[PDB]
Amino acid sequence: VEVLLGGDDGSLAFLPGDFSVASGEEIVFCNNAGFPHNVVFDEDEIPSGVDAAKISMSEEDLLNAPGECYKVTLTEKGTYKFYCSPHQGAGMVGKVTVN
Ligand SMILES: [Cl-]
Ligand SMILES: [Cu+2]
C-alpha cells in the first residue's frame, strides 16, 4: 500500500494516517509535499520482538527530493505508531494495524 507524505494543502500529514495492512504486505511512504520527511517507528509503540532500528529510517536521514519514498515490510501483528522526525511536533504521526 502507498501512503503520501504531506498534503497539497500544506498539511504535515501521512495520507492516510491510520490504516491497515496484512502481515508481510509492504508500505511505501512517498513524498508528496512539505518534505523533507522521514519515517520513524516509536520503539515504545510497536509489537514485542520488533527491532525499531530495522524498520525505521535513521532519525538523521531525510527524504529530501520530490520522487523519493521509503518502503518497509512489517510482519508481527498489532499496532505500530510512527512519525516524521522534523514534523513530529506539528502532528505528523501515524498508526498502522498489521493483521
Ligand atoms: Cl524486526
Ligand atoms: Cu515530515
Side-chain angles (χ1 to χ4, degrees), residues 2-97:
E2 185 178 1
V3 178
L4 300 180
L5 305 178
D8 292 319
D9 63 349
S11 61
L12 297 141
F14 293 92
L15 294 163
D18 191 322
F19 56 97
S20 302
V21 304
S23 183
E25 180 182 0
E26 66 177 12
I27 306 161
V28 179
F29 295 93
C30 286
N31 269 346
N32 178 62
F35 43 86
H37 301 293
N38 71 4
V39 188
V40 180
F41 293 86
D42 183 330
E43 72 202 337
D44 297 329
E45 314 290 345
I46 61 177
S48 185
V50 176
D51 188 338
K54 289 182 181 177
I55 58 157
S56 296
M57 294 181 58
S58 159
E59 197 109 16
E60 286 70 44
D61 291 345
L62 295 170
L63 307 173
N64 65 141
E68 296 177 341
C69 317
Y70 171 66
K71 162 192 184 175
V72 65
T73 305
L74 304 177
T75 59
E76 288 88 338
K77 283 166 205 182
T79 65
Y80 297 67
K81 301 177 197 197
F82 52 89
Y83 58 89
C84 169
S85 299
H87 297 135
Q88 182 180 21
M92 194 164 177
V93 305
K95 185 182 155 187
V96 53
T97 292

